[model samples]
Target: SVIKPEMKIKLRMEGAVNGHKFVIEGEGIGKPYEGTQTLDLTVEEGAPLPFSYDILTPAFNRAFTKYPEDIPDYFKQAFPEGYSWERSMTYEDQGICIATSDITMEGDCFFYEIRFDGTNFPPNGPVMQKKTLKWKSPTGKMYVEDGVLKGDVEMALLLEGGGHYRCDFKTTYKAKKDVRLPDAHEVDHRIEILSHDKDYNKVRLYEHAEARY
Candidate 1:
């Protein structure tokens, strides 16, 4: 007769950085086994700005803030008189305008879509170019939710002649996987786990088992 001593394990994610943490606890086991474990954390953005104006306006300003040095020479020359930061319309004559901005999410990631209406204003007209910029994260975690643009991301914008431009932003995650627990048996065992730190960041996992021998 094989006496398989039932065991249990717990995990916590209270103060983990951008990675995975595992602590195994068990008793009366002959051989230790490794299995699959999955942990998912979804972050979202663009919720507060559901309207086109709210989304694109801030996105435009963000582009300037993120790539101040990358502004095209033509754009600079066109704005030689120094442009006002009052409104998005300030860049219209310079052939740069954001028409719409939106966001969506799939799985563990979110996407940002920004549409621009532009023109070629002579000397700096027909702004044919590709601009890559970074989107800034919202102030707190409250701004994040599943299936919404949440974290910072690298955005690529295509500037062309027909007063049409589009921006795409994609986020990357640090760790994501499936978590495995012990199989069924004839015993009463339970598992509880918690993860966190001083920063108030936390995650948890719990499991219970009932087996008959």
Candidate 2:
């Protein structure tokens, strides 16, 4: 798949095992999309753009620190920038897949959804966030009532799409006159997932019957 910078991608997945696990992989190294300088067309000024490189750990750390309640620190480094929480935003060879810790299934299938947030900026520019994902894998399909994710589920890529995303996460804390995350701070956090798609199963134009009915 040809992925362009500043463009978001999406992926949808389903599992046949009771609780299958897989990893969502992404290519961090690639030449940036080439285009002319929009401000003024100076043929000589145009040049080949090189793909950017990132040190996974630090980026992930920053994302987690910025939105600890909504995003896990370990996953912060998993995505590219210029993307934020939004519907229709996607990542090529990106999106959530099975985790290695999930169980394997037999004949039955389990369904789930995953979204990615990616972004990019000029050599020296502000950070732009994009991308938002929402998944609906039935708990009953992968886990017993009140039980954690189980095994017997084979993992498979189900559906994927892309568009708008938003971040509406907040933390409630009780602090002194001027202190946040203080020694005696008590905070409540929440994450809200919102997606845009009239028909969840319509992502794959041809495989209309593949989605959960």
Candidate 3:
């Protein structure tokens, strides 16, 4: 049905990305940060995808030479155990995000892409995050078979600024029970497809310390 755009190809993908993340704070110390990044994303026509991040560890270890767990001095200080991960180390800047433009088939492989424009709910003033995602086939060419398409691809985001967030996934795309038309009611209730990654999350920040300078 992907060959038939009238169905409005919508793909929901889920996987995990294992890569390194680090930041060199203004004080200039750098280290590695990585754990788990669970990716649950959707791709559709001119789609809007919402995203949020807790990019705290990289910022903390870079600035304080401490992991999010190194307290006492990185200390909660004295709280009703009042502690938040601190304001300086997170990226919850996700909103009515935007996504994919279209679907194109070069071979049997069906490719998925996304472009997201996110508004940073800023404590450092308003920030703009522009990003993208694409499912690239490792088997070289992509195409459909038996009215369904399944493939393994490397989904990497080129939009990440602080570090590398790329993931590997085995994906699948198929019709929903002899579908008559293209509708979310039929498709969304099914499964996950579309591996994705963009080059960068273009962020525009308005801050006093010259942004990420």
Candidate 4:
């Protein structure tokens, strides 16, 4: 297999909306109701958001890192099985380095929960990381548009005994179905996944500093 593969990419895009691998214990559990479901998050302008983007290496089957003690059990749980270590991917769970490894069912390694339409992860192999990164938008409204991301972001996160690190991500993915987004401004947190063919998925959406620091 090639170290890198050819596929549509946004430098800012990494995981898939339908490829979310983890979730918190309460309120936020884990995978959505369905693979094609859409989730809209509130525009958080609060504190640093907790997050992580990881993969199960070919060698580390049920483990995340190289260290043996670095097992994937701490606060995390396997997706589709139970709750995850963190609620979302905020660069806090682990260092924010682009993980281009394919997420295998063996270890259940994966990126955070990003619900949107059009996002897809091949059944197996070549989990590519879209390098779609812009950066520094004063008063960033926080959202990924048509694979193009604009606004404030943090990177170089650490998941071990370190404080949280935050970053921004953006990329375009076509919405193939009705997408549900977390309601903001006037409505509740209930999101809607709208049917789309030409519309693009605002991949990295966080309108608040709660944007995950």
Residues 30-125 of candidate 4: C-alpha lDDT, one tens digit per residue: 221111122222222211211211221100111111112221121112222322111122233222223222221213223333221122333231
Tens-digit lDDT track for model 3 on 1-213?
122211111222221111112111111111111111112322222222223221211111111112233221111121112112111112333322222222223322222232222233433322223332222222211234464433333433334444433434333333323322111110001111223344212211111110010
Best by TM-score: 3
lDDT of 2 by residue, 32-135 (tens): 12210011011111111121111010111111122223322211232322112212212233332121111111122111132222343322311111122332
Which ten contiguous residues of candidate 2 have the minimum total lDDT? 53-62
Better of 2 and 4 by TM-score: 4
Candidate 2: where are CA atoms >4 Å away? Answer: 1-63, 67-189, 201-213
How far residue 152's Cα lies from its native spot in candidate 1, in Å, is 18
**lDDT of the structure predicted as candidate 3:** 0.23
Displacement of residue 146 (Cα, Å) in model 3 is 30
* lDDT at residue 184 of model 3 (Cα atoms): 16
Ranking by TM-score: 3, 1, 4, 2
lDDT of each: 0.23, 0.19, 0.23, 0.22
TM agreement with the true structure for every prediction: 0.19, 0.17, 0.21, 0.19
Q: What TM-score does candidate 2 get on C-alpha atoms?
A: 0.17
